[PDB]
Design a protein around this motif. Structure first.
Motif, PDB file in Angstrom:
ATOM      1  N   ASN A   6       0.836  -1.190   0.000  1.00 36.64           N
ATOM      2  CA  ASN A   6       0.000   0.000   0.000  1.00 36.64           C
ATOM      3  C   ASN A   6       0.875   1.245   0.000  1.00 36.64           C
ATOM      4  OD1 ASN A   6      -2.257   1.617   0.071  1.00 36.64           O
ATOM      5  ND2 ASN A   6      -2.649   1.330   2.261  1.00 36.64           N
ATOM      6  N   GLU A   7       0.375   2.311  -0.628  1.00 34.29           N
ATOM      7  CA  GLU A   7       1.088   3.582  -0.657  1.00 34.29           C
ATOM      8  C   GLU A   7       1.124   4.161   0.749  1.00 34.29           C
ATOM      9  OE1 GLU A   7      -1.627   3.167  -2.702  1.00 34.29           O
ATOM     10  OE2 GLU A   7      -0.650   2.741  -4.619  1.00 34.29           O
ATOM     11  N   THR A   8       2.272   4.039   1.405  1.00 34.21           N
ATOM     12  CA  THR A   8       2.391   4.269   2.840  1.00 34.21           C
ATOM     13  C   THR A   8       3.663   5.077   3.089  1.00 34.21           C
ATOM     14  OG1 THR A   8       3.390   2.064   3.102  1.00 34.21           O
ATOM     15  CG2 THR A   8       1.019   2.264   3.635  1.00 34.21           C
ATOM     16  N   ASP A   9       4.123   5.060   4.337  1.00 35.23           N
ATOM     17  CA  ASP A   9       5.295   5.815   4.752  1.00 35.23           C
ATOM     18  C   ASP A   9       6.559   5.264   4.090  1.00 35.23           C
ATOM     19  OD1 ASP A   9       7.000   7.550   6.153  1.00 35.23           O
ATOM     20  OD2 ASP A   9       7.105   6.202   7.880  1.00 35.23           O
ATOM     21  N   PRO A  10       7.355   6.106   3.423  1.00 37.00           N
ATOM     22  CA  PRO A  10       8.628   5.627   2.865  1.00 37.00           C
ATOM     23  C   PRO A  10       9.638   5.185   3.901  1.00 37.00           C
ATOM     24  CG  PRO A  10       7.880   7.510   1.642  1.00 37.00           C
ATOM     25  CD  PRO A  10       6.946   7.382   2.817  1.00 37.00           C
ATOM     26  N   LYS A  11       9.583   5.710   5.127  1.00 40.65           N
ATOM     27  CA  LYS A  11      10.380   5.118   6.196  1.00 40.65           C
ATOM     28  C   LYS A  11       9.897   3.709   6.508  1.00 40.65           C
ATOM     29  CE  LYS A  11      11.925   5.603  10.950  1.00 40.65           C
ATOM     30  NZ  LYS A  11      11.875   6.317  12.255  1.00 40.65           N
ATOM     31  N   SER A  12       8.585   3.481   6.426  1.00 43.29           N
ATOM     32  CA  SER A  12       8.079   2.122   6.567  1.00 43.29           C
ATOM     33  C   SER A  12       8.445   1.268   5.362  1.00 43.29           C
ATOM     34  CB  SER A  12       6.566   2.131   6.778  1.00 43.29           C
ATOM     35  OG  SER A  12       5.891   2.503   5.591  1.00 43.29           O
ATOM     36  N   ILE A  13       8.672   1.882   4.197  1.00 45.45           N
ATOM     37  CA  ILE A  13       9.198   1.135   3.054  1.00 45.45           C
ATOM     38  C   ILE A  13      10.643   0.729   3.315  1.00 45.45           C
ATOM     39  CG2 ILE A  13       9.637   1.225   0.566  1.00 45.45           C
ATOM     40  CD1 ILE A  13       7.417   3.243   0.312  1.00 45.45           C
ATOM     41  N   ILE A  14      11.408   1.620   3.947  1.00 42.18           N
ATOM     42  CA  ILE A  14      12.783   1.309   4.326  1.00 42.18           C
ATOM     43  C   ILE A  14      12.808   0.189   5.359  1.00 42.18           C
ATOM     44  CG2 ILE A  14      14.832   2.285   5.450  1.00 42.18           C
ATOM     45  CD1 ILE A  14      13.664   5.020   4.117  1.00 42.18           C
ATOM     46  N   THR A  15      11.853   0.212   6.289  1.00 43.93           N
ATOM     47  CA  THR A  15      11.678  -0.897   7.221  1.00 43.93           C
ATOM     48  C   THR A  15      11.273  -2.168   6.480  1.00 43.93           C
ATOM     49  OG1 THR A  15      11.015   0.694   8.914  1.00 43.93           O
ATOM     50  CG2 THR A  15      10.500  -1.615   9.318  1.00 43.93           C
ATOM     51  N   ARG A  16      10.424  -2.023   5.461  1.00 45.72           N
ATOM     52  CA  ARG A  16       9.954  -3.139   4.650  1.00 45.72           C
ATOM     53  C   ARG A  16      11.089  -3.784   3.862  1.00 45.72           C
ATOM     54  NH1 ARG A  16       5.938  -6.455   5.183  1.00 45.72           N
ATOM     55  NH2 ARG A  16       4.677  -4.657   5.846  1.00 45.72           N
ATOM     56  N   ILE A  17      12.141  -3.014   3.565  1.00 49.92           N
ATOM     57  CA  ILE A  17      13.284  -3.529   2.807  1.00 49.92           C
ATOM     58  C   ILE A  17      13.977  -4.662   3.562  1.00 49.92           C
ATOM     59  CG2 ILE A  17      15.597  -2.944   2.013  1.00 49.92           C
ATOM     60  CD1 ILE A  17      14.345  -0.163   1.266  1.00 49.92           C
ATOM     61  N   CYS A  18      14.399  -4.419   4.799  1.00 54.62           N
ATOM     62  CA  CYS A  18      14.942  -5.529   5.569  1.00 54.62           C
ATOM     63  C   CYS A  18      13.879  -6.227   6.407  1.00 54.62           C
ATOM     64  CB  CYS A  18      16.143  -5.107   6.416  1.00 54.62           C
ATOM     65  SG  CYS A  18      16.156  -3.488   7.171  1.00 54.62           S
ATOM     66  N   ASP A  19      12.604  -5.957   6.132  1.00 53.04           N
ATOM     67  CA  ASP A  19      11.585  -6.945   6.453  1.00 53.04           C
ATOM     68  C   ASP A  19      11.566  -8.065   5.424  1.00 53.04           C
ATOM     69  OD1 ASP A  19      10.530  -6.003   8.869  1.00 53.04           O
ATOM     70  OD2 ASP A  19       9.300  -4.516   7.819  1.00 53.04           O
ATOM     71  N   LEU A  20      11.577  -7.721   4.136  1.00 49.18           N
ATOM     72  CA  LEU A  20      11.616  -8.739   3.096  1.00 49.18           C
ATOM     73  C   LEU A  20      12.991  -9.369   2.956  1.00 49.18           C
ATOM     74  CD1 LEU A  20      12.947  -7.397   0.091  1.00 49.18           C
ATOM     75  CD2 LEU A  20      10.851  -6.069   0.414  1.00 49.18           C
ATOM     76  N   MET A  21      14.044  -8.715   3.459  1.00 46.40           N
ATOM     77  CA  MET A  21      15.307  -9.426   3.626  1.00 46.40           C
ATOM     78  C   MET A  21      15.173 -10.529   4.668  1.00 46.40           C
ATOM     79  SD  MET A  21      17.502  -8.331   1.470  1.00 46.40           S
ATOM     80  CE  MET A  21      17.515  -6.965   0.315  1.00 46.40           C
ATOM     81  N   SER A  22      14.393 -10.289   5.723  1.00 40.03           N
ATOM     82  CA  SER A  22      14.148 -11.348   6.694  1.00 40.03           C
ATOM     83  C   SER A  22      13.162 -12.384   6.174  1.00 40.03           C
ATOM     84  CB  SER A  22      13.647 -10.760   8.014  1.00 40.03           C
ATOM     85  OG  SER A  22      12.642  -9.790   7.798  1.00 40.03           O
ATOM     86  N   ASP A  23      12.335 -12.028   5.188  1.00 45.65           N
ATOM     87  CA  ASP A  23      11.471 -13.017   4.555  1.00 45.65           C
ATOM     88  C   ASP A  23      12.276 -13.976   3.690  1.00 45.65           C
ATOM     89  OD1 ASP A  23       9.593 -11.436   5.762  1.00 45.65           O
ATOM     90  OD2 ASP A  23       8.885 -10.503   3.905  1.00 45.65           O
ATOM     91  N   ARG A  24      13.247 -13.449   2.952  1.00 47.54           N
ATOM     92  CA  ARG A  24      14.098 -14.242   2.083  1.00 47.54           C
ATOM     93  C   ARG A  24      15.360 -13.439   1.826  1.00 47.54           C
ATOM     94  NH1 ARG A  24      12.958 -18.039  -2.310  1.00 47.54           N
ATOM     95  NH2 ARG A  24      10.826 -17.272  -2.662  1.00 47.54           N
ATOM     96  N   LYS A  25      16.482 -14.132   1.634  1.00 50.03           N
ATOM     97  CA  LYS A  25      17.714 -13.440   1.288  1.00 50.03           C
ATOM     98  C   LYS A  25      17.577 -12.892  -0.125  1.00 50.03           C
ATOM     99  CE  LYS A  25      21.680 -14.799   4.023  1.00 50.03           C
ATOM    100  NZ  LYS A  25      23.095 -15.228   3.847  1.00 50.03           N
ATOM    101  N   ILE A  26      17.186 -11.627  -0.220  1.00 50.35           N
ATOM    102  CA  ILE A  26      16.822 -11.009  -1.488  1.00 50.35           C
ATOM    103  C   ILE A  26      18.074 -10.383  -2.084  1.00 50.35           C
ATOM    104  CG2 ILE A  26      15.565  -9.100  -2.528  1.00 50.35           C
ATOM    105  CD1 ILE A  26      13.930 -11.644  -2.024  1.00 50.35           C
ATOM    106  N   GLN A  27      18.457 -10.845  -3.271  1.00 51.36           N
ATOM    107  CA  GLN A  27      19.535 -10.210  -4.014  1.00 51.36           C
ATOM    108  C   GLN A  27      19.000  -9.208  -5.026  1.00 51.36           C
ATOM    109  OE1 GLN A  27      23.449 -11.489  -3.771  1.00 51.36           O
ATOM    110  NE2 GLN A  27      22.823  -9.339  -3.626  1.00 51.36           N
TER     111      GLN A  27
END
Lengths: 49, 65
Positions: A6-27
């Motif tokens: 969802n179109e949300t806080d870009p700081k929460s997008i930055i949090t989402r970045i190493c949230d999905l890194m914790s979901d999978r080792k994303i290259q």
């Protein structure tokens, strides 16, 4: 990994970045984006760098 | 007429001097003092941005190294 975002806080997008890194080792990422966000384009690049 | 000024400081004695100057500004009108810090990680410095900008009174940031 087709994740929605969802179109949300870009700081929460930055949090989402190493949230999905914790979901999978994303290259590689792809992320669809809105058409009126150039300040966020100024945001995302130095976070990566 | 209340305001709250943001900064970055290594130690809190400079924040105490900042509050002394807040009083000297209050000689002329109200001024507050933010919780300032100097973190060794710029990731954590980016994470503190919402923690400091969470108020309406937040003013320009005075940044030290």
């Amino acid at each position: 990994e087709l994740v929605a975002m969802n179109e949300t806080d870009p700081k929460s997008i930055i949090t989402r970045i190493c949230d999905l890194m914790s979901d999978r080792k994303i290259q590689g990422v792809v992320f669809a984006d809105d058409t009126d966000q150039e300040a966020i384009a100024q945001i995302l690049d130095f976070i990566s760098a | 007429k209340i305001v709250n000024i943001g900064a970055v400081l290594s130690t809190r004695k400079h924040e105490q001097m900042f509050r002394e100057a807040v009083n000297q500004a209050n000689k002329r009108i109200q001024l507050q003092a933010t919780s300032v810090t100097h973190k060794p990680n710029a990731i954590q410095m980016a994470l503190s941005v919402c923690e400091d900008l969470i108020s309406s009174q937040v003013y320009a940031i005075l940044v030290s190294h």
